[PDB]
């Protein structure tokens, strides 16, 4: 309404847009439970990234709190049940990270195709083992895109320029609409045996938990490569390890995990697995857009 | 024609349908190379067969030595030239693989996927460290606009990159047809966020990226060399990475292969590959086809 607190390291545009809207802004970081509660005592708004934990205790203590903004995707650090219970509106910026997640996904596909992380590691270990490496050309290969939201769409248009056949599935996006962005929709069971590469870009739901599992992996072409830059758990982690161990899956690229940081190291340590510490939204540009989009939403409210 | 190395079965197809008689077999010794090359005008090789001065001089009927790939380091060029033997290669067969790796490299420079992988493999979860940059809206300068240069251009245009470049052989109209606006070299350096080289290695291209050109670059330029070692002056690249003038470099090639000076390979902002630009089975098969076509073009 009048005072907003930013409790994580956000792009400076966020403060600027809120102040342009007429709001007072406090910019703090790495605050503990009581530190955050004290700052919030005169704030009607709170903007977080992922580090600040908007727990039940935080929500209940901040009496003037009306809105909780998340500069990004995934409101896991916010207690939605406690927020709904206190009449606090919860906002996020899903759109702001779209290009960054799509670019990383394409980066991962290329990394799997040419074993770039493994090659760099080999080189940094003072080795020159050309004969140990053999990559694959993306041109003429089939990329399966499960989830045809904005991220899935951006991935498709970039990989089409490589000469990849882009096929996929989304129960919301019609075959006519996907055709307009070059994605041929087929029923799931038809997708699995055709893909050389599979990339998942769906929200995490009961219907999408373990979408890639022992049964669907068995339906895949031998040597399939899997990319998960969406949500941990869409690709059943145990089933993936089994697929990598048998050779059913020739490689996997993971940005997300069921537990972050993952305590089970079997996937990360696998020689055919490349990974990142959830870097999908980690670009100067994505952070700027998220900061802007959350500040605009807060100004729209007042 | 004799095929001395492990090649695609389509090599024989084009050679035979062209009218020539072929002999295959691989893993042939020094004397097994002196003999067997008895009565054929042509010889087709890859990387394993080392076409040395001794082999060349022993085969008096030899007129052409074909290489299924780029780079004739395994062929004694001086020795073939002495006997009047033509040495041909297939750089076009490797075009797609080299362009694909380059694009992979650009992506790795913006997001540091190889470094993030290594960090993850050491049990680390370093989010702040690997905060990257978006390719959309960035300028990619492409120096050398042959088939590799143009293939890189069209792929990176789908990422919303502004593709500029220079090639003294390629006309501004030809480059404009694949969305590359040509500008003189001195105008390219201050505009780029990323610079990638796809030129042959010649005195005109040796050290094309040097201390002077790096000082003309925008602070934090990311550099890619998937062409030939020496195009980017390695000493100048290291100075640029040290000051921060260059924020990162992706190298598939080195002046010396393997590189003995590990300072670039060991830099945290450098990603590298042991010359994998042509290391796909698809490039190998295509090179196999292209060299057979060239041998058939004898008339
Ligand atoms: C911006 C951005 O794309 N965000 S996002 O979270 O990736 C994203 C992805 C997709 C959508 C819409 C188009 N689709 C769904 O919500 C959807 C897809 C699936 C599904 C099930 C099984 C197999 C494949 C797909 N089930 N559902 C409910 C919205 C957001
Ligand atoms: C298939 C494939 O593309 N091979 S390739 O080796 O990349 C390749 C690259 C380019 C070409 C032709 C088109 N261009 C040249 O030969 C050229 C470019 C330059 C130059 C000098 C300074 C700055 C920028 C450019 N000088 N020369 C002599 C042929 C092959």
Sign of CA dihedral B163, B169, B173, B174: negative
- Helix %, strand %, coil % for chain A, to 5? 40, 20, 40
Cβ–Cβ below 8 Å for B131 and A284: yes
DSSP string across B138-178: -EEEEE--SHHHHHHHHHHHTTT-EEEEE-SSS-HHHHHHT
Which backbone phi and psi does B61 adopt, to 5 degrees?
-80, -20
Q: Quick one: which of A59, A54, A71 has its CA closest to A12?
A: A71
The burial of B151, by beta-carbon neighbours within 10 Å (0-12 exposed, 13-18 middle, 19 or more buried), is given as buried
Mutate to test the pocket of ligand 2, among B164, B184, B200 (most ligand atoms within 8 A of CB): B200
Q: Which of A201, A231, A270, A289 is catalytic?
A: A231
Single out the residue of A143, A102, A135 nearest to residue A116, CA to CA. Answer: A135
Handedness of CA A52, A54, A56, A57 (dihedral sign): positive
Of B245, B18, A75, B52, which is closest to residue B4 (Cα–Cα)? B52
Taking residue B245's Cβ as centre, other Cβ atoms within 10 Å add up to: 18
Contact residues for B110 (Cβ-Cβ < 8 A; gap 6+):
A103, A107, A283, B132, B133, B134, B135, B138, B222
User: What b/e readout covers A155-193, taking b as 16+ CB neighbours within 10 angstroms?
Assistant: bbbbbbbbebbbbbbbeebeeeebeeeebbbeeeeebbe
Pick the CATH number of B90-279 from 3.90.170.10, 3.40.50.720, 3.40.47.10, 3.40.50.10320: 3.40.50.720
Go through A79-103 and write b for each residue having 16 or more CB atoms within 10 A of its CB, e for each that does not.
beebbeebebeebbbbebbbbbbbb
Does the beta-carbon distance from B131 to A282 stay under 8 Å?
yes
Q: Buried b / exposed e across A212-227, counting CB within 10 Å, b at 16+? A: bbeebbeebeeebbbb
**Nearest CA among B286, B297, B299 for reference residue B11:** B286
CA angle B275, B111, B141 (to 5 degrees): 65
Active-site choice (A189, A260, A271, A285): A260
The response to whether A76 counts as a known ligand-binding position is no
Residue of chain B whose Cα is closest to the Cα of A162: B155
Instruction: Tell whether domain A1-92+283-302 is in CATH 3.30.450.40.
Output: no
Experimental method: X-ray
Q: Is A129 a catalytic residue?
A: no
What are the b/e assignments for B213-240, b being 16+ CB within 10 Å? Answer: bbeebeeebbbbbbbbbbbbbbebbbbb
Instruction: For chain B, give the residues followed by a break (C–N over 2.5 Å).
Output: none
CA distances from A53 to A33, A292, A294, B52, B108 (A): 8, 21, 18, 69, 32
Question: End-to-end alpha-carbon separation of chain B, Å?
Answer: 16
Round to whole Å and give the CA distance between A82 and A154.
35
Please, which residues 161-190 of chain A have a Cβ atom closer than 8 Å to chain B? 161-162
Map residue B67 onto helix, strand or coil: strand
* Omega prior to B258 cis, within 30 of 0: yes
The reply to whether B155 belongs to the active site is no
Helix, strand or coil, per DSSP, at residue A166:
strand
- Check if B12 is active-site: no
The response to whether B275 counts as a known ligand-binding position is yes
- Domain residue limits, chain A: 1-92+283-302, 93-282
Q: Do A276 and B132 touch (CB under 8 A)?
A: no
Q: Which residues have CB under 8 Å from A164's CB, separation 6+? A: A138, A139, A140, A141, A142, A143, A197
What are the counts of helices (DSSP H) followed by strands (DSSP E) for chain B?
Answer: 13, 11
Closest A-chain CA to B160? A158
Strand partners, A227: A199, A253
Cross-chain CB nearest to B134 (options A121, A134, A285): A285
Resolution (A): 2.0
Q: How many CB pairs under 8 A join A and B?
A: 180
| Cα–Cα distance for residue pair B120/A53, rounded to 1 Å | 24
In contact, A120 and A283? CB cutoff 8 Å: no
Q: Which among B102, B120, B179, B261 is the top mutation candidate for probing chain A, defined by the most A β-carbons within 10 Å of its own β-carbon? A: B120
The answer to whether the A1-92+283-302 and A93-282 domains have the same CATH topology is yes
Dihedral of alpha carbons A116, A120, A121, A127, sign: positive
Q: Tokens 């993936």, residue?
A: A240
Chain centroid offset of residue B36 CA:
32
Structure tokens belonging to residue A146: 């499960």
A278 labeled binding residue? yes
Quick check: A53 contacting B, CB < 8 Å?
no
Look up tokens 């990559």; give the residue: A135
The span from the CA of A45 to the CA of A62, in Å, is: 10
Q: Are A105 and A155 in contact (CB under 8 A)?
A: yes
| Rounded Cα–Cα distance for residues A181 and A36 (Å) | 45
Report domain B1-89+280-299's class.
alpha beta
At CA A139, angle to CA A138 and CA A144, rounded to 5? 60
Nearest CA to ligand 1 atom 24: A146
Which residue is associated with the tokens 């969406």? A230
> Atom of ligand 2 at shortest distance to CA of B227?
7
Q: Which parts of A48-201 fold into alpha helices (H)?
A: 56-61, 80-85, 98-114, 116-124, 150-160, 175-180, 188-191
B193 SS3 class = coil
Contacts of A133 in chain B (CB under 8 A): 273-274, 276, 279
Please provide residue B212's backbone torsions phi and psi, each rounded to the nearest 5 degrees. -65, -50
Taking Cα atoms as reference points, which of B36, B91, B44, B90 lies closest to residue B63? B44
Pocket test for ligand 1, best of A102, A103, A170 (most atoms within 8 A of CB): A170
Q: Measuring CA to CA, which residue among A54, A86, A82, A56 is closest to residue A70? A: A54
Q: Are A260 and A278 in contact (CB under 8 A)?
A: yes
Ligand 2 pocket at CB < 6 A: B 91-92, 95, 143-149, 166-170, 198-200, 202, 204-205, 208, 227
- Encoded tokens for B142: 């492409």
Comparing CA positions, the residue from A111, A131, A251, A274 lying closest to residue B105 is A111
Ligand 1 environment, Cβ below 6 A: A 94, 98, 146-152, 169-173, 201-203, 205, 207-208, 211, 230
Selected residue of B100, B179, B286 to mutate for chain A interface (largest A Cβ count, 10 A): B100
Evaluate the CA torsion angle A231, A236, A238, A242 in order and state its sign: negative
Cβ within 8 Å, pair B124-A99:
no
Q: How far apart are CA B101 and CA B160, in angstroms?
A: 18
The answer to whether the CB atoms of A119 and B274 lie below 8 A apart is: yes
Q: What is the CATH number of domain A93-282?
A: 3.40.50.720
List the catalytic residue out of B31, B60, B256, B257: B257
């Amino acid at each position: 309404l009048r005072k907003v607190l930013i409790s994580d390291s956000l792009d400076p545009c966020c403060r600027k847009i809120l102040q342009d809207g007429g709001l007072q802004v406090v910019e703090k970081q790495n605050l503990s439970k009581e530190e955050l509660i004290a700052e919030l005592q005169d704030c009607e708004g709170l903007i977080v990234r992922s580090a600040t934990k908007v727990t039940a205790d935080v929500i209940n203590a901040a009496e003037k709190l009306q809105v909780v903004g998340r500069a990004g995707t995934g409101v896991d650090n916010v207690d939605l049940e406690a927020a709904t219970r206190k009449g606090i509106l919860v906002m996020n910026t899903p759109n702001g990270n779209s290009l960054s997640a799509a670019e990383l996904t394409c980066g991962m596909i290329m990394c799997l195709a040419r074993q770039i992380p493994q090659a760099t590691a080999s080189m940094k270990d003072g080795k020159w083992e050309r004969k140990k490496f053999m990559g694959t050309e993306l041109n003429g290969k089939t990329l399966g895109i499960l989830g045809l939201g904005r991220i899935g769409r951006e991935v498709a248009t970039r990989m089409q320029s490589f000469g990849m056949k882009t096929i996929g599935y989304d129960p919301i996006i019609s075959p006519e609409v996907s055709a307009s962005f070059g994605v041929q929709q087929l029923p799931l069971e038809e997708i699995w045996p055709l893909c050389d590469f599979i990339t998942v870009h769906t929200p995490l739901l009961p219907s999408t938990t373990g979408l890639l599992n022992d049964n669907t992996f068995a339906q895949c072409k031998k040597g399939v490569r899997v990319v998960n830059c969406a949500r941990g758990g869409i690709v059943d982690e145990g089933a993936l390890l089994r697929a990598l161990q048998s050779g059913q899956c020739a490689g996997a690229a993971l940005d997300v995990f069921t537990e972050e940081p993952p305590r089970d190291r079997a996937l990360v340590d696998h020689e055919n697995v490349i990974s990142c510490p959830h870097l999908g939204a980690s670009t100067k540009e994505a952070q700027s857009r998220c900061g802007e989009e959350i500040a605009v939403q807060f100004v729209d409210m007042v």
